[PDB]
Every structure is written in C-alpha cells, then in structure tokens.
Amino acid sequence: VEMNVQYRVTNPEKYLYSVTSPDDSLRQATDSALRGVIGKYTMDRILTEGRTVIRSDTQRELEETIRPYDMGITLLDVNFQAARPPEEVKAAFDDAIAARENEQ
Amino acid sequence: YNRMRAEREAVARRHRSQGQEEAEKLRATADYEVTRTLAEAERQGRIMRGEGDAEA
C-alpha cells in the first residue's frame, strides 16, 4: 500500500523553533499512522475498498498524532496515487481473474 | 507466500471445473435430438423399402 500527503505551514515560528528537520518528522510519523490504519483490516477488504474506508481513518490518526508534538503544519488532505496490494512475488491472480471470463 | 498461492490457485481451478460441468451437461440434449431424428428417418425408409419388396 502507498499514499501521498500535501502539507502547508501556517505559523512559521513553530515551524522553526520546535522539533527540527520538518520532513523527517512528517514522513517518519506518517509511516506509523499508515501502519495503524492498515493493520486491522483483512486482505480482501484492503483489496476491494482501499479508497473509502481507510483514508479518512488515516486522516484522523495522522492529524491526531502530529498534535502533541506541537509543530506548525496543517494538512491539506491525503490521496491514493496508486494501489498494488498483491505482492510482486506472485502477482499471478491474472489467471485467477481471467478464470471467470474463461469459464463463461 | 506459498500458502496464499495455494489457496488462490485452488479457487481458480474450482471455477474451471464449475464451468466445464454444465458445459459438458449441455451436449447430451443435442446428441439425444440428433439420434431421435435419425431414428425417425430410418423408420420411414424401412416402411417404403417394404413397399418395394412386396410389389416385386
């Protein structure tokens, strides 16, 4: 699973005289938030509903977790640039999905 | 990884067999109809060959 974030600074002084090196904190907490959302849901559900159920939850969790650090950034949104859940090792459900048309 | 693969190929071949089932099912009716019509034709042919033999 992969995603993408868009961020914006409101108060510069909190962006300077606080936790250092902003992109480090942003990315390196977003990973934890993404784990938090992706964890609880089953494989098929992640395959099917990847664009509705998970994204709002990752919004809420990431916005919550950036709060205590008291840094200054406001999130635009998070999007879903691409989805490739079947692992690259065995992305051979092309047989499994072409099976239904071959059956009909 | 292999466990996933096994389950997934199992579902695939299940669909294979499920289709092939009624696929083979449907041919029996066609064979039945062709046999029946040929039998009727043979009956009529025998009748009129009998006509010919009797007059001879």
Add this chain to the structure above:
Amino acid sequence: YNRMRAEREAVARRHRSQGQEEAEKLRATADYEVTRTLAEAERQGRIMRGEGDAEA
C-alpha cells in the same frame, strides 16, 4: 548441539505426519461419493432399457 537439533526436528516431522494423515482421510470419502453417484445413474439406465424391451 546435535541432540537439540534432532529433538526439534522430530517435533516438526510429527506435525507434518498428522497433516498428511488427515489429507488421505478426506481424499478417500471424495471417491466414495463419486462411485455412489455413478451407481445411481446405472440403476436408472437399467430401468429405462427394461421398459423399452417390454414394449418391443
């Protein structure tokens, strides 16, 4: 070292043993069902052939 290795290797083997055992246990009943399904149709066919013979 060899003692420890042999012990837990034996554990793994016994697990795989129960696995394969249940495998053949299911495989047998599959074939049972197959043979029953064929026998039923054989009975039906014999009945129909008898009816045809009686009429003839």
Add this chain to the structure above:
Amino acid sequence: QYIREAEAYTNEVQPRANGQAQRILEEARAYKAQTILEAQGEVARFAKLLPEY
C-alpha cells in the same frame, strides 16, 4: 496448506462425476426411442410381405 489442498480436491473431482452421470442417463434414454422405432419398422415391413405370400 495440506488441509486446504485436500478439502479443495473434493469440489474439483465431484462435478465431473455429475456430468458423467447425466451423460449416461441421456444415452440410456436415447436407446429406448431407437429400439421402439426399429421394432415398428420391422413389424410394418413384414405385415405387407405376408399377403404377397
């Protein structure tokens, strides 16, 4: 994995048996029509030759 493969084998071996059963039954049905029509043909053919004799 072994358990899943074994339990999958059932549904991949049984429907083929159903298909074979239907084939057998259909052929059995066809035989009756063939034999009855042939019998009618033979009787009708003989009945006309007898008065010629």
